[PDB]
Amino acid sequence: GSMLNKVMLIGYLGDDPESKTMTSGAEVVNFRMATFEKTEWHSVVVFNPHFAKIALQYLHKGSKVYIEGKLQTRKWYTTEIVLPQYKGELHLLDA
Amino acid sequence: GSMLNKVMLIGYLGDDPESKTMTSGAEVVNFRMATFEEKTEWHSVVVFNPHFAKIALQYLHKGSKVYIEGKLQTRKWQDYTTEIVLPQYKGELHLLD
Ligand SMILES: [Ca+2]
């Protein structure tokens, strides 16, 4: 039956979104975000091209966002909230 | 204002759940679980909610399917690890076998 891997976060960006050009020729947007009830820093990676351009065009340090993604751990360990190529959600709140 | 830190997982344990007693004297249950739709993802789960902890020890085993709802937490260690935590009074753990 089903299987699920879903992270939902509403919080504030720690710096401007940064953009790195991949092996693929694609642009991948990375930023860090804080959630609190002291504060949790989450490392977010945006491959979804549509949400990537939106991060670069509209997000900045201090921006509040809503993020849906997948939890992924890579072996050089680092766990990131990944918005994969055809999935995920990214929405600017408080705009 | 609004704030949210929530992770939802449906997957299979990679090992029987383990009980450790903390500094607090609190009994904490840990296990690793796997998800998949490059590779399968291993999530490190930490259950402080005593009710879901007892359920995990009594009813979960290597290979059991489970639904987990917790929050994402990364903690520094001296020589980082990110965990899905079911905190003392929150979280959700559901058997799906
Ligand atoms: Ca929107």
Side-chain angles (χ1 to χ4, degrees), chain A residues 2-19 21-26 28-31 33-36 39-45:
Chain A
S2 29
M3 276 223 25
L4 178 63
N5 175 354
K6 184 65 68 196
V7 188
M8 298 151 69
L9 310 167
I10 286 169
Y12 299 88
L13 263 72
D15 317 72
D16 295 336
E18 346 202 336
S19 170
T21 292
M22 257 12 188
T23 297
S24 66
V28 181
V29 171
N30 87 100
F31 56 87
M33 67 178 282
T35 60
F36 30 99
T39 83
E40 275 309 316
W41 288 97
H42 312 264
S43 171
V44 185
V45 173

mmCIF file of all heavy atoms in Angstrom, chain A residues 2-45, unseen atoms left out:
data_model
loop_
_atom_site.group_PDB
_atom_site.id
_atom_site.type_symbol
_atom_site.label_atom_id
_atom_site.label_comp_id
_atom_site.label_asym_id
_atom_site.label_seq_id
_atom_site.Cartn_x
_atom_site.Cartn_y
_atom_site.Cartn_z
ATOM 1 N N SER A 2 0.252 2.370 0.466
ATOM 2 C CA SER A 2 0.929 3.657 0.453
ATOM 3 C C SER A 2 2.317 3.668 1.133
ATOM 4 O O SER A 2 2.666 2.765 1.907
ATOM 5 C CB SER A 2 0.020 4.746 1.065
ATOM 6 O OG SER A 2 -0.870 4.185 2.024
ATOM 7 N N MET A 3 3.094 4.696 0.801
ATOM 8 C CA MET A 3 4.327 5.032 1.490
ATOM 9 C C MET A 3 4.465 6.560 1.467
ATOM 10 O O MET A 3 4.027 7.219 0.519
ATOM 11 C CB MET A 3 5.520 4.343 0.853
ATOM 12 C CG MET A 3 5.724 2.893 1.353
ATOM 13 S SD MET A 3 7.475 2.548 1.672
ATOM 14 C CE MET A 3 7.961 4.246 1.973
ATOM 15 N N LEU A 4 5.028 7.147 2.511
ATOM 16 C CA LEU A 4 4.937 8.591 2.593
ATOM 17 C C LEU A 4 6.206 9.177 3.179
ATOM 18 O O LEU A 4 6.795 8.614 4.120
ATOM 19 C CB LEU A 4 3.712 8.970 3.419
ATOM 20 C CG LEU A 4 3.393 10.436 3.696
ATOM 21 C CD1 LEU A 4 3.092 11.189 2.420
ATOM 22 C CD2 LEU A 4 2.188 10.501 4.635
ATOM 23 N N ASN A 5 6.627 10.304 2.611
ATOM 24 C CA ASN A 5 7.765 11.032 3.127
ATOM 25 C C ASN A 5 7.519 12.489 2.859
ATOM 26 O O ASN A 5 7.790 12.974 1.779
ATOM 27 C CB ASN A 5 9.040 10.556 2.447
ATOM 28 C CG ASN A 5 10.272 11.370 2.854
ATOM 29 O OD1 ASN A 5 10.170 12.385 3.574
ATOM 30 N ND2 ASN A 5 11.444 10.931 2.381
ATOM 31 N N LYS A 6 7.033 13.195 3.860
ATOM 32 C CA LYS A 6 6.476 14.533 3.679
ATOM 33 C C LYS A 6 6.894 15.393 4.879
ATOM 34 O O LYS A 6 6.627 15.025 6.018
ATOM 35 C CB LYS A 6 4.941 14.391 3.654
ATOM 36 C CG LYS A 6 4.118 15.672 3.387
ATOM 37 C CD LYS A 6 4.364 16.238 1.998
ATOM 38 C CE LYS A 6 3.786 15.282 0.997
ATOM 39 N NZ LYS A 6 4.337 15.612 -0.312
ATOM 40 N N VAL A 7 7.554 16.514 4.617
ATOM 41 C CA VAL A 7 7.839 17.496 5.629
ATOM 42 C C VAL A 7 6.999 18.743 5.319
ATOM 43 O O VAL A 7 6.938 19.150 4.161
ATOM 44 C CB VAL A 7 9.311 17.925 5.575
ATOM 45 C CG1 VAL A 7 9.636 18.811 6.753
ATOM 46 C CG2 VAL A 7 10.225 16.716 5.559
ATOM 47 N N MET A 8 6.370 19.339 6.336
ATOM 48 C CA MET A 8 5.645 20.617 6.210
ATOM 49 C C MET A 8 6.239 21.626 7.197
ATOM 50 O O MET A 8 6.289 21.346 8.424
ATOM 51 C CB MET A 8 4.174 20.416 6.556
ATOM 52 C CG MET A 8 3.465 19.446 5.619
ATOM 53 S SD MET A 8 2.158 18.668 6.554
ATOM 54 C CE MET A 8 1.082 20.091 6.764
ATOM 55 N N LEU A 9 6.681 22.777 6.668
ATOM 56 C CA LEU A 9 7.295 23.831 7.485
ATOM 57 C C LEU A 9 6.771 25.196 7.115
ATOM 58 O O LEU A 9 6.677 25.521 5.933
ATOM 59 C CB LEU A 9 8.799 23.901 7.254
ATOM 60 C CG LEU A 9 9.645 22.654 7.319
ATOM 61 C CD1 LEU A 9 10.991 23.062 6.719
ATOM 62 C CD2 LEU A 9 9.783 22.262 8.784
ATOM 63 N N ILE A 10 6.504 26.011 8.128
ATOM 64 C CA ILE A 10 6.181 27.433 7.957
ATOM 65 C C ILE A 10 7.222 28.150 8.791
ATOM 66 O O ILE A 10 7.282 27.916 9.974
ATOM 67 C CB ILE A 10 4.767 27.731 8.508
ATOM 68 C CG1 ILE A 10 3.725 27.176 7.548
ATOM 69 C CG2 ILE A 10 4.530 29.227 8.676
ATOM 70 C CD1 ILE A 10 2.355 27.192 8.146
ATOM 71 N N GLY A 11 8.062 28.986 8.183
ATOM 72 C CA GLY A 11 9.108 29.715 8.919
ATOM 73 C C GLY A 11 9.794 30.784 8.072
ATOM 74 O O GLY A 11 9.309 31.147 6.984
ATOM 75 N N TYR A 12 10.953 31.245 8.548
ATOM 76 C CA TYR A 12 11.604 32.429 8.052
ATOM 77 C C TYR A 12 12.980 32.108 7.520
ATOM 78 O O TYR A 12 13.755 31.380 8.172
ATOM 79 C CB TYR A 12 11.752 33.429 9.193
ATOM 80 C CG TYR A 12 10.406 33.861 9.764
ATOM 81 C CD1 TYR A 12 9.793 33.131 10.783
ATOM 82 C CD2 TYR A 12 9.736 34.990 9.258
ATOM 83 C CE1 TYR A 12 8.550 33.519 11.293
ATOM 84 C CE2 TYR A 12 8.511 35.384 9.761
ATOM 85 C CZ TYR A 12 7.920 34.640 10.771
ATOM 86 O OH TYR A 12 6.693 35.015 11.264
ATOM 87 N N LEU A 13 13.296 32.660 6.357
ATOM 88 C CA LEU A 13 14.588 32.432 5.716
ATOM 89 C C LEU A 13 15.743 33.089 6.468
ATOM 90 O O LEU A 13 15.605 34.217 6.958
ATOM 91 C CB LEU A 13 14.565 32.947 4.271
ATOM 92 C CG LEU A 13 14.298 31.882 3.249
ATOM 93 C CD1 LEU A 13 12.854 31.389 3.272
ATOM 94 C CD2 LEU A 13 14.744 32.411 1.860
ATOM 95 N N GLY A 14 16.884 32.400 6.509
ATOM 96 C CA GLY A 14 18.069 32.869 7.224
ATOM 97 C C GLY A 14 18.964 33.785 6.404
ATOM 98 O O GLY A 14 19.620 34.652 6.968
ATOM 99 N N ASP A 15 19.015 33.571 5.085
ATOM 100 C CA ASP A 15 19.657 34.488 4.119
ATOM 101 C C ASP A 15 18.873 34.530 2.822
ATOM 102 O O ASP A 15 17.895 33.799 2.648
ATOM 103 C CB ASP A 15 21.074 34.043 3.737
ATOM 104 C CG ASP A 15 21.895 33.584 4.923
ATOM 105 O OD1 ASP A 15 21.578 32.473 5.429
ATOM 106 O OD2 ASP A 15 22.846 34.323 5.335
ATOM 107 N N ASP A 16 19.344 35.344 1.885
ATOM 108 C CA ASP A 16 18.832 35.299 0.521
ATOM 109 C C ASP A 16 18.944 33.878 -0.066
ATOM 110 O O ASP A 16 19.881 33.135 0.260
ATOM 111 C CB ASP A 16 19.580 36.309 -0.354
ATOM 112 C CG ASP A 16 19.323 37.746 0.067
ATOM 113 O OD1 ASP A 16 18.263 38.005 0.690
ATOM 114 O OD2 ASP A 16 20.172 38.618 -0.224
ATOM 115 N N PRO A 17 17.982 33.478 -0.905
ATOM 116 C CA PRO A 17 18.124 32.211 -1.608
ATOM 117 C C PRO A 17 19.373 32.221 -2.514
ATOM 118 O O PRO A 17 19.638 33.241 -3.185
ATOM 119 C CB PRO A 17 16.862 32.158 -2.464
ATOM 120 C CG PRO A 17 15.919 33.057 -1.812
ATOM 121 C CD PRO A 17 16.719 34.146 -1.233
ATOM 122 N N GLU A 18 20.156 31.133 -2.493
ATOM 123 C CA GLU A 18 21.341 30.996 -3.375
ATOM 124 C C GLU A 18 21.076 29.977 -4.507
ATOM 125 O O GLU A 18 20.266 29.057 -4.374
ATOM 126 C CB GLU A 18 22.623 30.624 -2.597
ATOM 127 C CG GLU A 18 22.550 30.783 -1.054
ATOM 128 C CD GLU A 18 23.928 30.939 -0.348
ATOM 129 O OE1 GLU A 18 24.969 30.492 -0.893
ATOM 130 O OE2 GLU A 18 23.960 31.521 0.771
ATOM 131 N N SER A 19 21.774 30.127 -5.617
ATOM 132 C CA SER A 19 21.491 29.334 -6.810
ATOM 133 C C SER A 19 22.767 28.700 -7.320
ATOM 134 O O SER A 19 23.733 29.396 -7.590
ATOM 135 C CB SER A 19 20.866 30.233 -7.877
ATOM 136 O OG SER A 19 20.785 29.585 -9.128
ATOM 137 N N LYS A 20 22.779 27.379 -7.425
ATOM 138 C CA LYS A 20 23.935 26.679 -7.958
ATOM 139 C C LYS A 20 23.534 25.930 -9.222
ATOM 140 O O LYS A 20 22.472 25.302 -9.289
ATOM 141 C CB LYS A 20 24.537 25.730 -6.917
ATOM 142 N N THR A 21 24.374 26.018 -10.234
ATOM 143 C CA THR A 21 24.124 25.311 -11.480
ATOM 144 C C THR A 21 24.616 23.862 -11.384
ATOM 145 O O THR A 21 25.806 23.607 -11.159
ATOM 146 C CB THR A 21 24.745 26.075 -12.675
ATOM 147 O OG1 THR A 21 24.029 27.307 -12.851
ATOM 148 C CG2 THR A 21 24.697 25.246 -13.981
ATOM 149 N N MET A 22 23.684 22.929 -11.550
ATOM 150 C CA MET A 22 23.946 21.491 -11.424
ATOM 151 C C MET A 22 24.729 20.893 -12.626
ATOM 152 O O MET A 22 24.961 21.578 -13.631
ATOM 153 C CB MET A 22 22.607 20.754 -11.224
ATOM 154 C CG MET A 22 22.269 20.292 -9.802
ATOM 155 S SD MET A 22 23.340 20.987 -8.512
ATOM 156 C CE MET A 22 22.805 20.039 -7.057
ATOM 157 N N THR A 23 25.125 19.621 -12.489
ATOM 158 C CA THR A 23 25.702 18.806 -13.573
ATOM 159 C C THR A 23 24.745 18.722 -14.756
ATOM 160 O O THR A 23 25.152 18.685 -15.925
ATOM 161 C CB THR A 23 25.957 17.359 -13.074
ATOM 162 O OG1 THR A 23 26.921 17.377 -12.018
ATOM 163 C CG2 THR A 23 26.465 16.447 -14.197
ATOM 164 N N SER A 24 23.464 18.702 -14.406
ATOM 165 C CA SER A 24 22.364 18.548 -15.336
ATOM 166 C C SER A 24 22.126 19.767 -16.221
ATOM 167 O O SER A 24 21.400 19.689 -17.205
ATOM 168 C CB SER A 24 21.106 18.304 -14.532
ATOM 169 O OG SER A 24 20.804 19.458 -13.775
ATOM 170 N N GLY A 25 22.710 20.899 -15.848
ATOM 171 C CA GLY A 25 22.428 22.159 -16.506
ATOM 172 C C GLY A 25 21.267 22.861 -15.834
ATOM 173 O O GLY A 25 20.975 23.998 -16.174
ATOM 174 N N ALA A 26 20.606 22.191 -14.887
ATOM 175 C CA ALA A 26 19.497 22.789 -14.121
ATOM 176 C C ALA A 26 19.981 23.718 -13.018
ATOM 177 O O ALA A 26 21.106 23.587 -12.539
ATOM 178 C CB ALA A 26 18.598 21.705 -13.509
ATOM 179 N N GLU A 27 19.117 24.651 -12.621
ATOM 180 C CA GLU A 27 19.377 25.520 -11.473
ATOM 181 C C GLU A 27 18.704 24.960 -10.225
ATOM 182 O O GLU A 27 17.536 24.522 -10.245
ATOM 183 C CB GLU A 27 18.920 26.961 -11.738
ATOM 184 N N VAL A 28 19.476 24.940 -9.150
ATOM 185 C CA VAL A 28 19.028 24.379 -7.895
ATOM 186 C C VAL A 28 19.179 25.459 -6.847
ATOM 187 O O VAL A 28 20.255 26.031 -6.683
ATOM 188 C CB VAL A 28 19.851 23.151 -7.531
ATOM 189 C CG1 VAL A 28 19.380 22.550 -6.235
ATOM 190 C CG2 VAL A 28 19.717 22.126 -8.639
ATOM 191 N N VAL A 29 18.088 25.747 -6.151
ATOM 192 C CA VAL A 29 18.053 26.873 -5.252
ATOM 193 C C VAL A 29 18.152 26.361 -3.809
ATOM 194 O O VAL A 29 17.427 25.434 -3.414
ATOM 195 C CB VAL A 29 16.797 27.726 -5.531
ATOM 196 C CG1 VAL A 29 16.597 28.787 -4.464
ATOM 197 C CG2 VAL A 29 16.902 28.381 -6.910
ATOM 198 N N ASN A 30 19.082 26.918 -3.038
ATOM 199 C CA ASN A 30 19.210 26.512 -1.657
ATOM 200 C C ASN A 30 19.039 27.690 -0.687
ATOM 201 O O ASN A 30 19.483 28.820 -0.960
ATOM 202 C CB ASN A 30 20.523 25.773 -1.416
ATOM 203 C CG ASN A 30 21.661 26.716 -1.105
ATOM 204 O OD1 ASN A 30 22.029 26.903 0.064
ATOM 205 N ND2 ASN A 30 22.196 27.367 -2.140
ATOM 206 N N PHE A 31 18.360 27.422 0.420
ATOM 207 C CA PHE A 31 18.272 28.365 1.549
ATOM 208 C C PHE A 31 18.072 27.611 2.885
ATOM 209 O O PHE A 31 17.738 26.397 2.917
ATOM 210 C CB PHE A 31 17.193 29.452 1.340
ATOM 211 C CG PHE A 31 15.809 28.917 1.069
ATOM 212 C CD1 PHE A 31 14.940 28.604 2.116
ATOM 213 C CD2 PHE A 31 15.357 28.753 -0.239
ATOM 214 C CE1 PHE A 31 13.612 28.108 1.865
ATOM 215 C CE2 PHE A 31 14.059 28.258 -0.511
ATOM 216 C CZ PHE A 31 13.188 27.928 0.556
ATOM 217 N N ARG A 32 18.296 28.332 3.974
ATOM 218 C CA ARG A 32 18.117 27.797 5.317
ATOM 219 C C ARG A 32 16.925 28.500 5.907
ATOM 220 O O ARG A 32 16.722 29.692 5.646
ATOM 221 C CB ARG A 32 19.376 28.026 6.178
ATOM 222 N N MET A 33 16.118 27.772 6.687
ATOM 223 C CA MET A 33 14.972 28.395 7.340
ATOM 224 C C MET A 33 14.765 27.970 8.799
ATOM 225 O O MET A 33 15.040 26.814 9.185
ATOM 226 C CB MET A 33 13.690 28.203 6.505
ATOM 227 C CG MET A 33 13.161 26.786 6.387
ATOM 228 S SD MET A 33 11.625 26.727 5.445
ATOM 229 C CE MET A 33 10.453 27.289 6.675
ATOM 230 N N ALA A 34 14.254 28.910 9.592
ATOM 231 C CA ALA A 34 14.060 28.728 11.020
ATOM 232 C C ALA A 34 12.597 28.480 11.372
ATOM 233 O O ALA A 34 11.718 29.173 10.861
ATOM 234 C CB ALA A 34 14.565 29.958 11.753
ATOM 235 N N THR A 35 12.337 27.473 12.212
ATOM 236 C CA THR A 35 11.036 27.329 12.881
ATOM 237 C C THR A 35 11.246 27.331 14.375
ATOM 238 O O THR A 35 12.270 26.871 14.856
ATOM 239 C CB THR A 35 10.278 26.050 12.505
ATOM 240 O OG1 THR A 35 11.054 24.884 12.849
ATOM 241 C CG2 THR A 35 9.924 26.052 11.034
ATOM 242 N N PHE A 36 10.295 27.873 15.120
ATOM 243 C CA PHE A 36 10.398 27.838 16.568
ATOM 244 C C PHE A 36 9.042 27.571 17.206
ATOM 245 O O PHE A 36 7.989 27.798 16.582
ATOM 246 C CB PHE A 36 11.036 29.131 17.126
ATOM 247 C CG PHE A 36 10.764 30.354 16.293
ATOM 248 C CD1 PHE A 36 9.754 31.243 16.650
ATOM 249 C CD2 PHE A 36 11.515 30.612 15.135
ATOM 250 C CE1 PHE A 36 9.491 32.377 15.859
ATOM 251 C CE2 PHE A 36 11.275 31.751 14.351
ATOM 252 C CZ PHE A 36 10.262 32.632 14.704
ATOM 253 N N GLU A 37 9.096 27.058 18.438
ATOM 254 C CA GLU A 37 7.929 26.853 19.302
ATOM 255 C C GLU A 37 7.302 28.200 19.690
ATOM 256 O O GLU A 37 8.013 29.134 20.081
ATOM 257 C CB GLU A 37 8.343 26.084 20.576
ATOM 258 N N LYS A 38 16.196 26.110 20.610
ATOM 259 C CA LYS A 38 15.097 27.069 20.698
ATOM 260 C C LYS A 38 14.472 27.283 19.307
ATOM 261 O O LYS A 38 13.238 27.156 19.140
ATOM 262 C CB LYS A 38 15.583 28.392 21.301
ATOM 263 N N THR A 39 15.322 27.601 18.322
ATOM 264 C CA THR A 39 14.910 27.633 16.916
ATOM 265 C C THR A 39 15.541 26.459 16.163
ATOM 266 O O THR A 39 16.701 26.086 16.414
ATOM 267 C CB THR A 39 15.231 28.985 16.162
ATOM 268 O OG1 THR A 39 16.589 28.993 15.707
ATOM 269 C CG2 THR A 39 14.961 30.243 17.025
ATOM 270 N N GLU A 40 14.762 25.869 15.261
ATOM 271 C CA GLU A 40 15.250 24.832 14.381
ATOM 272 C C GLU A 40 15.665 25.432 13.046
ATOM 273 O O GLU A 40 14.880 26.126 12.401
ATOM 274 C CB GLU A 40 14.187 23.745 14.171
ATOM 275 C CG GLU A 40 14.141 22.647 15.224
ATOM 276 C CD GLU A 40 15.501 21.968 15.519
ATOM 277 O OE1 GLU A 40 16.269 21.635 14.568
ATOM 278 O OE2 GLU A 40 15.787 21.778 16.737
ATOM 279 N N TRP A 41 16.907 25.175 12.645
ATOM 280 C CA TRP A 41 17.366 25.550 11.299
ATOM 281 C C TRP A 41 17.220 24.372 10.364
ATOM 282 O O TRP A 41 17.733 23.286 10.642
ATOM 283 C CB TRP A 41 18.807 26.074 11.315
ATOM 284 C CG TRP A 41 18.858 27.418 11.927
ATOM 285 C CD1 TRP A 41 19.169 27.721 13.227
ATOM 286 C CD2 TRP A 41 18.503 28.655 11.303
ATOM 287 N NE1 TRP A 41 19.066 29.082 13.441
ATOM 288 C CE2 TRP A 41 18.658 29.678 12.276
ATOM 289 C CE3 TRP A 41 18.077 29.003 10.015
ATOM 290 C CZ2 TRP A 41 18.412 31.027 11.995
ATOM 291 C CZ3 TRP A 41 17.842 30.350 9.733
ATOM 292 C CH2 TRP A 41 18.003 31.342 10.722
ATOM 293 N N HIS A 42 16.503 24.577 9.271
ATOM 294 C CA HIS A 42 16.298 23.526 8.300
ATOM 295 C C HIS A 42 16.934 23.959 7.001
ATOM 296 O O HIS A 42 16.797 25.135 6.564
ATOM 297 C CB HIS A 42 14.814 23.285 8.062
ATOM 298 C CG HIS A 42 14.012 23.162 9.325
ATOM 299 N ND1 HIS A 42 13.690 21.946 9.887
ATOM 300 C CD2 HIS A 42 13.475 24.108 10.137
ATOM 301 C CE1 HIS A 42 12.982 22.147 10.987
ATOM 302 N NE2 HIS A 42 12.843 23.449 11.165
ATOM 303 N N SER A 43 17.623 23.005 6.389
ATOM 304 C CA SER A 43 18.319 23.225 5.168
ATOM 305 C C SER A 43 17.433 22.778 4.008
ATOM 306 O O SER A 43 17.098 21.601 3.895
ATOM 307 C CB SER A 43 19.623 22.445 5.232
ATOM 308 O OG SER A 43 20.235 22.465 3.971
ATOM 309 N N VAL A 44 17.012 23.718 3.168
ATOM 310 C CA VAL A 44 16.068 23.413 2.090
ATOM 311 C C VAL A 44 16.738 23.532 0.717
ATOM 312 O O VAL A 44 17.534 24.481 0.454
ATOM 313 C CB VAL A 44 14.858 24.357 2.127
ATOM 314 C CG1 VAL A 44 13.818 23.956 1.080
ATOM 315 C CG2 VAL A 44 14.213 24.344 3.492
ATOM 316 N N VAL A 45 16.385 22.586 -0.157
ATOM 317 C CA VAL A 45 16.979 22.421 -1.492
ATOM 318 C C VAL A 45 15.854 22.350 -2.519
ATOM 319 O O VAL A 45 14.983 21.463 -2.413
ATOM 320 C CB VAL A 45 17.834 21.131 -1.580
ATOM 321 C CG1 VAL A 45 18.300 20.878 -3.019
ATOM 322 C CG2 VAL A 45 19.092 21.216 -0.648
#
